[PDB]
Amino acid sequence: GYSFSLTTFSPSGKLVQIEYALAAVAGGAPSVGIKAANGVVLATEKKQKSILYDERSVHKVEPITKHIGLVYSGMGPDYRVLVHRARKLAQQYYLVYQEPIPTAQLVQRVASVMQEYTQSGGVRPFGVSLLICGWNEGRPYLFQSDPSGAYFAWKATAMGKNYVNGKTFLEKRYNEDLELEDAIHTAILTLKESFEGQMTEDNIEVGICNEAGFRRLTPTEVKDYLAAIA
Amino acid sequence: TNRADTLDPALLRPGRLDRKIEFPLPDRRQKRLIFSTITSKMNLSEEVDLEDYVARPDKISGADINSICQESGMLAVRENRYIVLAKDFEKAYKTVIKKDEQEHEFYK
Amino acid sequence: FNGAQCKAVCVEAGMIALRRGATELTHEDYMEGILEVQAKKKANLQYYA
Amino acid sequence: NQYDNDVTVWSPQGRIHQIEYAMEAVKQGSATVGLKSKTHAVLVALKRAQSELAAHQKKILHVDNHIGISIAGLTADARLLCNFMRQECLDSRFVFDRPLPVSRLVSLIGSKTQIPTQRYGRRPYGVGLLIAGYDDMGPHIFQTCPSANYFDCRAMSIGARSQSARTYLERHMSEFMECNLNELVKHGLRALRETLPAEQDLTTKNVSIGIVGKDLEFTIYDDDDVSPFLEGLEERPQ
Amino acid sequence: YDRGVNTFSPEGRLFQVEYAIEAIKLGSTAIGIQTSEGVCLAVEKRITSPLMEPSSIEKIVEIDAHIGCAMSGLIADAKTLIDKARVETQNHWFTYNETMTVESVTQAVSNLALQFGEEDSRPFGVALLFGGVDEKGPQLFHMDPSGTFVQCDARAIGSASEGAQSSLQEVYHKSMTLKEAIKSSLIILKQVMEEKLNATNIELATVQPGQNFHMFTKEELEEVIKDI
Amino acid sequence: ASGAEVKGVCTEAGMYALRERRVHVTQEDFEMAVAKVMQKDSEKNMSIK
Amino acid sequence: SYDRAITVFSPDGHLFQVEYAQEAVKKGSTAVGVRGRDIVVLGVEKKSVAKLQDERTVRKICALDDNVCMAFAGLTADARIVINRARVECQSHRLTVEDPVTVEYITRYIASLKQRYTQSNGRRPFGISALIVGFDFDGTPRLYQTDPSGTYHAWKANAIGRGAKSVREFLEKNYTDEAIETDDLTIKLVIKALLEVVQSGGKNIELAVMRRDQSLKILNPEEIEKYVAEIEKEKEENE
Amino acid sequence: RYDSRTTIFSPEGRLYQVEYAMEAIGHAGTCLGILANDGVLLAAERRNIHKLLDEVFFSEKIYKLNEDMACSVAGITSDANVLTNELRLIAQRYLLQYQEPIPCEQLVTALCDIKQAYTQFGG
Amino acid sequence: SAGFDRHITIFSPEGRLYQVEYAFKAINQGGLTSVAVRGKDCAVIVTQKKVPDKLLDSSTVTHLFKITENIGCVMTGMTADSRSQVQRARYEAANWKYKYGYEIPVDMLCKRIADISQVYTQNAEMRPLGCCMILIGIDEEQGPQVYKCDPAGYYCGFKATAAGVKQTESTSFLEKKVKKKFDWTFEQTVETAITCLSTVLSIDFKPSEIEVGVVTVENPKFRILTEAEIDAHLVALAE
Amino acid sequence: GRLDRKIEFSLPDLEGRTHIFKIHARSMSVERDIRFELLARLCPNSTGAEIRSVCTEAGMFAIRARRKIATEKDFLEAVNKVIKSYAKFSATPRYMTYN
Amino acid sequence: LLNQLDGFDSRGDVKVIMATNRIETLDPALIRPGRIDRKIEFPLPDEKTKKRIFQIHTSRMTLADDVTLDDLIMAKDDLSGADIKAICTEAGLMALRERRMKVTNEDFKKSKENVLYKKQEGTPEGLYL
Amino acid sequence: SHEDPGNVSYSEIGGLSEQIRELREVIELPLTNPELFQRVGIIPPKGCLLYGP
Amino acid sequence: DTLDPALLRPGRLDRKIHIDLPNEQARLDILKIHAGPITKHGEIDYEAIVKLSD
């Protein structure tokens, strides 16, 4: 019975309310994202609870600009909040500099926002881990954040249920050199490793990032591609 | 037991762990097996399908399949038939751990 | 006054009349059993002016 | 009893005990008695001292040309509501260029003391106001409470052992309405001489009388226009 | 429990102010005596070290040309009240070309003796003795942390004030003189102090209507002490 | 680790050779045993520090 | 009450946290200071050199003006804040009043800032105790000390930090009215005080003086060695 | 016992969050600098050396802060971004004010005052 | 578990927070049932009333709150949260109409209400408005819509929709009923709504207890049915 | 009708402690020129048994030096011993802030 | 012991001294007056006498006198004299372990870090400073 | 054990007829006959709990 | 509630069945059980007893 709340350190350890938010992230819906040579592939795992829900209303894959994709693994109600913050911030950058914002500067400022919520002492942290990507100046990128304010840079990663198992498959399956199609193939493979047995044109939801810009794929080509891709 | 806060300064150790093996629990594909074995103890009319509720996220850990079997078959013993309906599955999914449920489906 | 204080008042009427060596009880000694402050104390009093 | 600390908490019997504790803090003041005739309103209080040599802590204080208050309880809140009272008096005396009716002033007092009884961060005011005034319809004797449930009466009495005073007020409230100032004031101190234990007598220096009249401005008196008020008495019936 | 300035008691009362009235008692003593000839006042310094320079310890400070003071207990709450009291009498002289009388001074102090509030800070820990000469002659005044301000004819504060009041009520009456009250005060002092009475322990402060300036005795106090 | 998780990896690599059928104990068998008795402790997105 | 927080009185009338923030001062390094009649002198002990750094930045004696000097004990960060604000305050006094700054004014400022810092809501009290030595008005030497309560308190000699009772007991057993200064008895008195330090290692001694017209003079640990030598010579002459 | 918040003191008197921030330092990446004239160097340990990163940042612990100063870092990572931005902004405001580079000791004391502002206040 | 006694909005171990999943049955203290259905170019709300009193009125027990001229809603849970949420919805729809010049689509309104509930959830020291809201409306190029807003701030929206007390059973009937691919010719919708509530609650009652709110792409105005035509539909499904 | 009075007492007031000062001053070897009310101020909460301890401790100081005529300073340092230097160790004082 | 020690069987002149380290397990029936009058603690000593106790414990050995015990004297904040005993003897034991008459300062390091389990008196503090 | 007085049957109680019949099916049956349980082949159940005010 | 959820798993105890506070017919029937050995007359207002009880 301690820590409680956000203003004071432990006797020796860490920030238990951030560790619990990370556990709530790890208890979330799975996702996978892979940086290839020319593009970046994002893929989530979106199961409706009943047969009643519609798949055209809520969207996991969400663009920040015309060339910057972003998925998560956590809670949509906080996700939309920090999405809207990132929207307004990226449009403020484009007001200041009249140039589309680079992804490193996005990740700096979004990390500053999340860090400002981790400061004391009445607000809770986000239960949201991001996977940010974009194609700025030829070389595409991939940046994962976390509730603690930190950030990383990945070649391919995963987040959600069985991220450890999916990551051990990613270490074996993926490599340095692929194209976007082979990236989607290995991405649906590593998401199909951990998802339920019935995977359709609606249970997944996939957006890509070519150098020609962000592209959020449709259920038509998603159903064409995952119609027993291997 | 369930709670694991009792040892490993001495059970699972460098050197002591020669066959001291950690044992978690089974994945999906196992509830189907329990549904195959314990419902083979009853008579199984000839056609009341069974994968229709593994697709429900029941999570009913692997004793209470027999609780479903007991309450369901003996509810058919209120009719004293040995032959099984799908109504046994609804009455053993609204008299068993239908409490928590189902949902919550927020926050993932 | 509860019955506790009923007993307290009548025995204090005995005792107050037992002070001065009166021959029997006296009405003012009953009243000073009652003016044994109705067992409500003290006060210091300080700030109540 | 672990719910019995703050103003915000409703009790599981619904009685917020901070209000009850403020009432009990009011019950430990000095005795005071206010009562009105048809034409004159008189409030009489009792003084005390810290020691023999020191002077007595005063209770009747002036407010306005036709308003005067008695008091019991805390003195910081007393002077706080005094300054607010004088302020609201000179506010309407500035704006409307009329003397205030008493009822709207005491409604403003209740609305003033409402906020420290509902939000968190202020205490209820330990206060013992007995207000005498003159609107167009004659004298008024109001009383307050720390629960801001102000009352109108014809004769009240608050403070320590003030209940025998209330019995006297019961057995003379029919007689109060007809008389002029002098026997009215001596009915007031024929309440105060029963607000005291019987083994000591009310002297000059410990009593205070404030009269406001329909043509008479509010005036406090101390020992010298009270030496006329203290004669005209007999002893208590021993 | 009671823990906090914003909670009463089941029987009264604070319980923060009461702990302040307790916190008075640890301070050094002081004795002021009203006489119609004028107000005299005395204090004990309780000098600890020979390095402790005696004229730097303030007990009697100067508010006005005819208004003195003495402090108690905590030092710095007294410093706050003295600073503000000095400022406000000067404001009175500003808007009225006259001297703020001592009752008006102490009402002006006890307007915020209890303005204690941390939201919407703590209660002060000092007892004050006020002497001065208004138009009604001399005045001697005593306040407390709770703002319950009263006039006193000869008040004693702080440590050992019980026997100070008792032996003070033994000797005092209304038609005393000045020097008799001075030596009667320092008799009570060297019955309630612990060290030998000498030139450095105590200090006097006397104000007269014809001697409004210099409410102090400086080493003629030696001559006063050696007359006992 | 404290002394002989060496022996844990050796034994569980022998167990992997036991479930399978081999007589040569290669390095990948030991590395699978490392994956058995070296994972948990694991768990990143926690470097912070 | 309890040892939580600064706003509550004790059941017997104390403030626990002023007394408890005095303990960090009571368990800090020692620094003494005396006044001669024309030259003032003070200094700190426990140089505590860890064999591998510089120490010109860790100086515990600084100045605000050309007339006044500093010292402290307790923890050093609160000393850094108070000194930073004190420089500003001394200069702001120089802004309006065109005098050289009197020592009594800046000590009243330090104690007033310290107390209004202690009164407020949840601000931790400054656990220091400064020594403020200067000679301005007709070259009159003064030295005042502070407290976490905020009580400026004028002395003639002083001892703070660890075991300050023993050190002040030596100044008690020395402190002669004669003579005078005479800047030689004052130098030798500093030598006797630093010899009376809690350790008196001979190399951890750091002393700086002011002759009431000059600026601060940092000494050299060879002159102090001859001072220790003549102290040992007088100790042999006692026998 | 006397834990609850960063303020107030412990009964000896020590501090709680100061030592516990130090014990939060102790489990982090190792840095050092060396004694050299005509140059100075830094050393740093790579946390998270896993094979699926990018290393495209050129700097994870070093922060080239003004022009002629860099800084390593150790401890909780994301507080340091708040600190490095603010430190760069302090030195840059100095350069704006004087058009002379910052002489580094008032820079260090500025950051120490920034940290000390959260050591004193509460909570 | 807790342990932590879940008093404020923090994260507990493994891994949830308990305040919102206590707020999810503040709906369940309402004692009330709501069903929404979208089949075709219409949309139907149905909700009963629990009036035991003859002294109580019948017009002002209405839960169907006409948000705007093309958007309706129904509320369950406690009444004060519901009505305050409704005035927030009206105010923000009017804000849309002022700022952007045209009628708000029902999606953005649910997004804005969800965001308000999330801000009420993100910052503490406010109760998280324990009521659930179902919206309906017609949009051009999308037909009709049915949406649900959570107290947590999780909006969603879908074909056959139900929230309240007994809606695990209602969604069980709507899985067992919206699985056959027939069209829904508006009396199919009204009949399935009345009979789904009539099988969940199993009452088969007067036309004076349920309230029916409809919207159709022939008159896009929100419309509340009358006792006569409610009786007409009820005897039209009476075989 | 058996045990019906319940005589009350508690800690003495101040003058009770002066009377106990009289009592345990007269029954041992002190000097008859000293006062006690200052010592009575120094005992806000104490017992007459602890007044016996105070008088025997002033006797301990009167053993230390060869004293059969107890000064005021003997009882001064006796009370200073008992209530401030033996209440627990010595160091609840050692700050001014007050005087 | 209670009924015999300071019961009856008249006391007179029989000196009895009892000694402990801790006081928690003491029945207060024996702590009360009549039976035991004076209560006497002992402070772990100041450094001003640590210099003498370290000197005298090192008074009867050979030692390379360049080394400074003031490190050891200032270091351990709650030293007893058994600490000083074991230090001043065990440093000579570490030196004479390899037959050296005089002791190096890192033999004092080894000695003190044997004697105290985890010699943890540096920061905290360490950083007064 | 043998302090137990036998009572009247369930004619004293009522309004729990569902609980009477169903709890009878979970208590009384396998000692009347345990082999309808063995006609279907299922092991009989074990126990229940009563609760409320 | 305070029973450990290791005991709430079926097989050990099959189901937790609830006995409620009675309804109108329940109160009436158990009342007429209790109305038995009574020297009553034609006066027994059953509905007032059951409805005025809650």
Curated annotation (Swiss-Prot), chain A:
Gene Ontology terms: biological process: proteasome-mediated ubiquitin-dependent protein catabolic process; response to virus
Keywords: Acetylation, Cytoplasm, Nucleus, Phosphoprotein, Proteasome
Subcellular localization: Cytoplasm; Nucleus
Residues modified to N6-acetyllysine: 66, 167
Sites of Phosphotyrosine modification: 2, 20, 72, 117
Protein name as annotated: Proteasome subunit alpha type-2
One Gene Ontology term, aspect cellular component: proteasome complex
Keyword Glycoprotein annotated: no
Induction info: Down-regulated by antioxidants BO-653 and probucol. Down-regulated in response to enterovirus 71 (EV71) infection (at protein level).
Outcome of swapping residue 106 to V: In a colorectal cancer sample; somatic mutation
Top-rank taxon: Eukaryota
Protein family: Belongs to the peptidase T1A family.
Main location per the UniProt record: cytoplasm
PTM comment text: Phosphorylated on tyrosine residues; which may be important for nuclear import.
InterPro entries assigned to the protein according to its UniProt record, in alphabetical order: Ntn_hydrolases_N, Proteasome_alpha, Proteasome_alpha-type, Proteasome_asu_N, Proteasome_sua/b
Organism per entry: Homo sapiens (Human)
Residue positions where Phosphoserine is found in the record: 3, 10, 12
Function: Component of the 20S core proteasome complex involved in the proteolytic degradation of most intracellular proteins. This complex plays numerous essential roles within the cell by associating with different regulatory particles. Associated with two 19S regulatory particles, forms the 26S proteasome and thus participates in the ATP-dependent degradation of ubiquitinated proteins.
Keyword Cell division among UniProt keywords: no
Swiss-Prot record, chain C:
Encoding gene, per UniProt annotation: PSMC3
Post-translational modification: Sumoylated by UBE2I in response to MEKK1-mediated stimuli.
Record's disease association: Deafness, cataract, impaired intellectual development, and polyneuropathy: An autosomal recessive disease characterized by early onset of deafness, cataract, severe developmental delay, and severely impaired intellectual development. Patients later develop polyneuropathy of the lower extremities, associated with depigmentation of the hair in that area.
Complexes and interactors: Component of the 19S proteasome regulatory particle complex. The 26S proteasome consists of a 20S core particle (CP) and two 19S regulatory subunits (RP). The regulatory particle is made of a lid composed of 9 subunits, a base containing 6 ATPases including PSMC3 and few additional components. Interacts with PAAF1.
Protein's organism: Homo sapiens (Human)
Protein name: 26S proteasome regulatory subunit 6A
Family the entry assigns: Belongs to the AAA ATPase family.
Entry's localization field: Cytoplasm; Nucleus
UniProtKB/Swiss-Prot annotation, chain E:
Pfam families in the record: Proteasome, Proteasome_A_N
Annotated positions of the Phosphoserine modification: 9, 49, 56
Tissue and organ expression note: Expressed in fetal brain (at protein level).
Alphabetically ordered keywords of this record: Acetylation, Cytoplasm, Glycoprotein, Nucleus, Phosphoprotein, Proteasome
Residues found modified as Phosphothreonine: 48
InterPro entries from the UniProt entry: Ntn_hydrolases_N (IPR029055), Proteasome_alpha (IPR050115), Proteasome_alpha-type (IPR023332), Proteasome_alpha_type_5 (IPR033812), Proteasome_asu_N (IPR000426), Proteasome_sua/b (IPR001353)
Glycosylation sites: 185
Subcellular location per the Swiss-Prot or TrEMBL entry: Cytoplasm; Nucleus
Principal location listed in the UniProt entry: cytoplasm
Role summary: Component of the 20S core proteasome complex involved in the proteolytic degradation of most intracellular proteins. This complex plays numerous essential roles within the cell by associating with different regulatory particles. Associated with two 19S regulatory particles, forms the 26S proteasome and thus participates in the ATP-dependent degradation of ubiquitinated proteins.
Protein's name according to its UniProt entry: Proteasome subunit alpha type-5
Organism: Homo sapiens
UniProtKB/Swiss-Prot annotation, chain M:
Cell compartment(s), UniProt: Cytoplasm; Nucleus
Coiled-coil stretches: none
Domain of life of the organism encoding this protein: Eukaryota
Functional summary from the UniProt entry: Component of the 26S proteasome, a multiprotein complex involved in the ATP-dependent degradation of ubiquitinated proteins. This complex plays a key role in the maintenance of protein homeostasis by removing misfolded or damaged proteins, which could impair cellular functions, and by removing proteins whose functions are no longer required. Therefore, the proteasome participates in numerous cellular processes, including cell cycle progression, apoptosis, or DNA damage repair.
Complex formation: Component of the 19S proteasome regulatory particle complex. The 26S proteasome consists of a 20S core particle (CP) and two 19S regulatory subunits (RP). The regulatory particle is made of a lid composed of 9 subunits, a base containing 6 ATPases including PSMC6 and few additional components. Interacts with PAAF1.
Family assignment from sequence similarity: Belongs to the AAA ATPase family.
Name assigned to this protein: 26S proteasome regulatory subunit 10B
Species of provenance: Homo sapiens
Residue range from the parent sequence: 283 to 336 of 389
